[PDB]
Amino acid sequence: DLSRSDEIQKARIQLPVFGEEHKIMEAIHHNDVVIICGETGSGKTTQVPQFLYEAGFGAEDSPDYPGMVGITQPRRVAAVSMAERVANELGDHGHKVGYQIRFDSTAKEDTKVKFMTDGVLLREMMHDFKLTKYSSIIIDEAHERNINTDILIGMLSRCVRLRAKLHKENPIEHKKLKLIIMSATLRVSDFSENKTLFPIAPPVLQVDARQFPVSIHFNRRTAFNYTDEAFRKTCKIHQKLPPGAILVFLTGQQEITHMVKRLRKEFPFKKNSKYNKDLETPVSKMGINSKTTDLEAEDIDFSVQVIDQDKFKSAIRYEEDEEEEEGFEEVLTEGQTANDPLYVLPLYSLLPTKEQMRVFQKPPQGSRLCIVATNVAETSLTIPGVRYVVDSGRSKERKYNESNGVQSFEVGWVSKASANQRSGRAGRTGPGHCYRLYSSAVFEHDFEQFSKPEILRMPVESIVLQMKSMAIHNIINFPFPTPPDRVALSKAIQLLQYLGALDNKEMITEDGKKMSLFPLSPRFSKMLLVSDEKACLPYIVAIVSALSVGDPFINEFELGINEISRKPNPDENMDPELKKELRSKFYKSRSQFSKLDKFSDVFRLLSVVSAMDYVPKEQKEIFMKKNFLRGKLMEEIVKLRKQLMYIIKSNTSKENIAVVIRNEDLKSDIPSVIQIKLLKQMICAGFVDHVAVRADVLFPDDAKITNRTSIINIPYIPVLATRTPNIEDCFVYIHPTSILNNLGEMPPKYMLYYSLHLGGNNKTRMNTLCDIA
Ligand SMILES: Nc1ncnc2c1ncn2[C@@H]1O[C@H](COP(=O)(O)OP(=O)(O)O)[C@@H](O)[C@H]1O
Numbered sequence: 001d002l003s004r005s006d007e008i009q010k011a012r013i014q015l016p017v018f019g020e021e022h023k024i025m026e027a028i029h030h031n032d033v034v035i036i037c038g039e040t041g042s043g044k045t046t047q048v049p050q051f052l053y054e055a056g057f058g059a060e061d062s063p064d065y066p067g068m069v070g071i072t073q074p075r076r077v078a079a080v081s082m083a084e085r086v087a088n089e090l091g092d093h094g095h096k097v098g099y100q101i102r103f104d105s106t107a108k109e110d111t112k113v114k115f116m117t118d119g120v121l122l123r124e125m126m127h128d129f130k131l132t133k134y135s136s137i138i139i140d141e142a143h144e145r146n147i148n149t150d151i152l153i154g155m156l157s158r159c160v161r162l163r164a165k166l167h168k169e170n171p172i173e174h175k176k177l178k179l180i181i182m183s184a185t186l187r188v189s190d191f192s193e194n195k196t197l198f199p200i201a202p203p204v205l206q207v208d209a210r211q212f213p214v215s216i217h218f219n220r221r222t223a224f225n226y227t228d229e230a231f232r233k234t235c236k237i238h239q240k241l242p243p244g245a246i247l248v249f250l251t252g253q254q255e256i257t258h259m260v261k262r263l264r265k266e267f268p269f270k271k272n273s274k275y276n277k278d279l280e281t282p283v284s285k286m287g288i289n290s291k292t293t294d295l296e297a298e299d300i301d302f303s304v305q306v307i308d309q310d311k312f313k314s315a316i317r318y319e320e321d322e323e324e325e326e327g328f329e330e331v332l333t334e335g336q337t338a339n340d341p342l343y344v345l346p347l348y349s350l351l352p353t354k355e356q357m358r359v360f361q362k363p364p365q366g367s368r369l370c371i372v373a374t375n376v377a378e379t380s381l382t383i384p385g386v387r388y389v390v391d392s393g394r395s396k397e398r399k400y401n402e403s404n405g406v407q408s409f410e411v412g413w414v415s416k417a418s419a420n421q422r423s424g425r426a427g428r429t430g431p432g433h434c435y436r437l438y439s440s441a442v443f444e445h446d447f448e449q450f451s452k453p454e455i456l457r458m459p460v461e462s463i464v465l466q467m468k469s470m471a472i473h474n475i476i477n478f479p480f481p482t483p484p485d486r487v488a489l490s491k492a493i494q495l496l497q498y499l500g501a502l503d504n505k506e507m508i509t510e511d512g513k514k515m516s517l518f519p520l521s522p523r524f525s526k527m528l529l530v531s532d533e534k535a536c537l538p539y540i541v542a543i544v545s546a547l548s549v550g551d552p553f554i555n556e557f558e559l560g561i562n563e564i565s566r567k568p569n570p571d572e573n574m575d576p577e578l579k580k581e582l583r584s585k586f587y588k589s590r591s592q593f594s595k596l597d598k599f600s601d602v603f604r605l606l607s608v609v610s611a612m613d614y615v616p617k618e619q620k621e622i623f624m625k626k627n628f629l630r631g632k633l634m635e636e637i638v639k640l641r642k643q644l645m646y647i648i649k650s651n652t653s654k655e656n657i658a659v660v661i662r663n664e665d666l667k668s669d670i671p672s673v674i675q676i677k678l679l680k681q682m683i684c685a686g687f688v689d690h691v692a693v694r695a696d697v698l699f700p701d702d703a704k705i706t707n708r709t710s711i712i713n714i715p716y717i718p719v720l721a722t723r724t725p726n727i728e729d730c731f732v733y734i735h736p737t738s739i740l741n742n743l744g745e746m747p748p749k750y751m752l753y754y755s756l757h758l759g760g761n762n763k764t765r766m767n768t769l770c771d772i773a
């Protein structure tokens with residue numbers, strides 16, 4: 001027999017999924033694949049595994065369902081917390097419940113209900129595709145559309161098909177597999193209507209959760225300093241409004257730690273109270289890297305966007321086209337004071353497990369609970385008693401810049417769907433309030449309706465590399481929920497081959513696996529991997545960071561000081577002396593960063609970035625102004641170098657003991673001559689498919705050229721280019737801003753280019769990196 005406590009079984013009957021047990025189990029008995037949709041707090045994660053367990057799934061001599069019940073989460077916080085909750089709810093059967101969030105954790109013997117991440121199950125499928133240890137797999141939180149979730153759903157479609165075939169043949173020897181996909185929303189047509197996933201559409205069950213009304217309060221304007229605004233709003237809620245918990249939505253650990261410290265200092269418990277160490281978080285993050293667990297966007301610090309208040313405000317100035325703050329008309333109730341202690345706790349994915357469990361316990365009497373969380377608390381779990389939500393409206397998400405191939409992880413607006421999901425957390429126990437730290441205008445105009453599936457926010461070569469690191473062989477025909485185009489997939493496989501991440505039979509190499517460990521686009525990952533020779537790693541880190549952020553050099557044409565037009569075509573129609581003096585100082589400044597190498601634009605980049613570390617704080621602006629630099633880009637490059645250094649150091653160890661890096665660690669020696677030649681080979685490894693040979697070499701005497709041709713007129717041809725019936729439609733040229741223009745000597749024979757550019761219609765121009773010998 002199974003025996004739960006009175007508290008437990010009475011909590012369960014309130015949950016809307018509990019009431020639909022009948023329809024759910026009926027569908028599961030009649031169908032191998034079932035989709036269940038229900039809002040957060042419905043009881044999906046806690047109750048469906050219990051339904052299966054009570055039905056005999058995993059029972060030690062079940063004739064049809066002896067395998068475990070596996071349930072995946074895209075979020076490891078949810079995996080662990082919801083495992084602990086289900087173990088509690090199973091009473092004297094709770095020992096059957098375990099979890100696994102690390103690759104090399106080996107789970108308990110008697111575990112029959114197993115919570116794990118996405119990536120854990122993907123890895124188990126490498127050793128047993130059929131997942132024979134499992135009677136049922138629940139893919140949870142699918143509406144988040146993380147890349148591993150999409151991949152797992154495709155993999156499981158094949159697995160369930162195969163298990164059904166084998167079970168049809170011999171049911172004593174091969175058991176069926178029940179696949180259940182669970183979603184917070186109805187947006188499941190990429191699963192339910194996808195015929196390559198499910199030839200026969202699975203049933204879609206809807207659970208009708210009862211959410212109390214939540215009053216939505218927009219701020220009048222949208223503050224740039226959202227952490228200060230959230231602190232301010234949280235204090236006002238706490239001091240004026242009746243009992244109930246506060247959930248604050250920030251974007252990452254650093255912000256959360258700082259905000260929790262401010263709140264504890266503002267509303268402490270009495271001096272040397274026991275509670276002022278139940279709140280202590282002596283370890284800000286667990287030792288974690290990509291070798292042991294699947295990094296989530298939230299965990300990765302690699303941001304390339306300039307933060308800038310002026311740019312922010314001008315981007316949203318339409319809100320200035322149209323008195324008290326709304327949502328503060330309720331008052332304190334008896335036994336409350338404006339200065340009650342705040343039982344404030346952090347909640348983010350890097351948080352140690354024992355600390356992350358504190359958020360479900362009741363606050364001590366006479367205090368108010370405040371959870372400062374990332375969007376882990378948006379749909380993946382529920383904090384009891386939340387009456388007030390404070391929404392920064394933002395999150396850290398993966399982004400892919402199509403124009404330059406840079407993958408990064410950036411703070412930006414969430415979708416409207418996500419904002420509404422955040423608000424809803426204030427409506428689980430009773431009517432509540434959500435305080436959005438942004439205007440109704442900004443919400444309307446700049447919050448996208450729906451967030452893009454992560455597969456659409458990735459370099460396709462990253463998608464392919466991840467699947468290949470999971471030993472998924474057939475990429476082209478893989479049943480994606482949202483498939484990339486076959487052409488892009490083929491090109492991505494070929495790129496990974498040029499990078500040596502896939503071999504000639506399209507299988508991952510050892511260097512491929514190492515690259516798959518990095519959160520960067522594979523060209524950059526490759527350059528960092530081959531870089532640990534002759535103390536060259538820091539130079540490559542500087543170069544990758546500069547390329548990721550962008551060109552900090554303001555050029556003559558942007559300064560409006562060019563003597564000759566950018567383009568030679570003769571179309572369209574104080575200041576002079578000053579312009580000539582500006583040109584003088586500009587070419588001097590440029591030359592000052594061109595001393596490491598005479599042919600290589602990438603090394604003038606390295607040069608400014610290196611010089612930047614010797615310019616003390618009070619010189620930055622003078623430095624910037626004197627050198628026509630984009631100071632915000634330079635500062636961002638400093639920050640990114642430090643982030644990337646942390647990423648590498650965290651990867652060297654198995655357990656992360658990487659130390660905070662300080663600005664003084666970036667001080668570089670200027671590279672030696674052989675160091676420079678080597679850097680050129682490393683960069684070339686990242687861009688092997690981008691070499692351009694002077695047309696006069698491949699074809700001498702068959703094409704025009706003269707003694708005094710402008711350098712910018714000297715034709716190059718990318719070796720991998722598609723020769724056309726009329727050839728010259730395919731040549732490319734050196735840009736007039738490059739270092740090469742100051743040669744006079746003839747330009748190199750083999751040049752390495754970052755990319756080619758066609759806007760600016762004279763001719764296709766090269767964005768040059770360096771020469772190849
Ligand atoms: N320690 C706990 N962990 C998780 N949920 C808890 C805990 N204690 C109580 N609960 C309650 O259990 C319910 C869990 O619902 P859940 O299964 O997470 O729904 P869904 O997965 O559909 O969002 C919540 O309403 C929450 O209030």
Ligand SMILES: [Mg+2]
Nearest residue numbers: 044045380381
């Ligand atoms: Mg859930």
